[PDB]
């Protein structure tokens, strides 16, 4: 399963200059392009090696369109400020996300496009890619505006055509980095307390993509309720990590089994602490 996404964030800062605009494109969990208005010379820049082969026409076109997005979004910031009758001295955040998901057969399974204002859902394109859902009475103005312009038609065209096509291209060009399935390196750690109890921590390291399932078994039973699970985190080298801990009665460690499920895995593995 694969997907391509583009995100953007426009952040006003009255008194500290023009609103900052950042835009970025991801293939799955890998960022491959980035634009930042705070750069000395704003432009769409590569963030992955496999996109660096695109010629100057590509970068020239991406940078030009993205600079246009920035201008449209700075204007949006300020239409919304009007809609909510907010102070000209206040700071606000407008976020955007658009993307296409490809099934395991390689054809479109779903596309989107949504907006959030000050951390709240604002406007979203519906699954049918032909209608919109407004989160409040301000967003309804935007919704009516989009409907009157029949813009959904153009967004759908991108999601069904360009998005899928280029995702397929990036997947091929960065095949070694993108269509790879590292399996996580796993092990369980033992942390005693004196005679009564010990913490068993199940580790999953160096895996990609970030999607993974960790679960603890005691004679073949999930413990979800008393298991502390940390948010999956980036190692910093392109892989992810995650651990699941469970406090068990001393002397019964062997009754617990960790269940790890990752795509790079050929079969879900089961770990058990080594004495």
């Amino acid at each position: 399963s694969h997907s391509m996404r583009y995100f953007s964030a426009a952040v006003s800062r009255p008194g500290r200059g023009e609103p900052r605009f950042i835009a970025m494109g991801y293939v799955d969990d890998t960022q491959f392009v980035r634009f930042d208005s705070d750069s000395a010379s704003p432009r769409m820049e590569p963030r992955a090696p496999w996109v660096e082969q695109e010629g100057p026409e590509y970068w020239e076109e991406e940078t030009r369109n993205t600079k246009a997005h920035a201008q449209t979004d700075r204007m949006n910031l300020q239409t919304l400020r009007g809609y909510y009758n907010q102070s000209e001295a206040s700071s606000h955040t407008l976020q955007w996300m658009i993307g296409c998901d490809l099934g395991s057969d390689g054809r479109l399974i779903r596309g989107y496009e949504r907006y959030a204002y000050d951390g709240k859902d604002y406007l979203a394109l519906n699954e049918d890619l032909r209608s919109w859902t407004a989160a409040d009475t301000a967003a309804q103005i935007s919704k009516r505006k989009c409907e009157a312009a029949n813009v959904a038609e153009q967004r759908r065209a991108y999601l069904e055509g360009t998005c899928v096509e280029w995702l397929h291209r990036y997947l091929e060009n960065g095949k070694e980095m993108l269509q790879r399935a590292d399996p996580p390196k796993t092990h369980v750690t033992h942390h005693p307390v004196f005679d009564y109890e010990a913490t068993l921590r199940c580790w999953a390291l160096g895996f990609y993509p970030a999607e993974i399932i960790l679960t603890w078994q005691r004679d073949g039973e999930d413990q979800t309720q008393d298991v502390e699970l940390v948010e999956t985190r980036p190692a910093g080298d392109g892989t992810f990590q995650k651990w699941a801990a469970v406090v068990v009665p001393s002397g019964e460690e062997q009754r617990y089994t960790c269940h790890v499920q990752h795509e790079g895995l050929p079969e879900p593995l089961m770990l058990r602490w080594k004495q």
Partner: peptide
């Protein structure tokens, strides 16, 4: 490939 235009809200 980013979509050409951003939406006007």
């Amino acid at each position: 490939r980013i979509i050409p235009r951003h939406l006007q809200l």
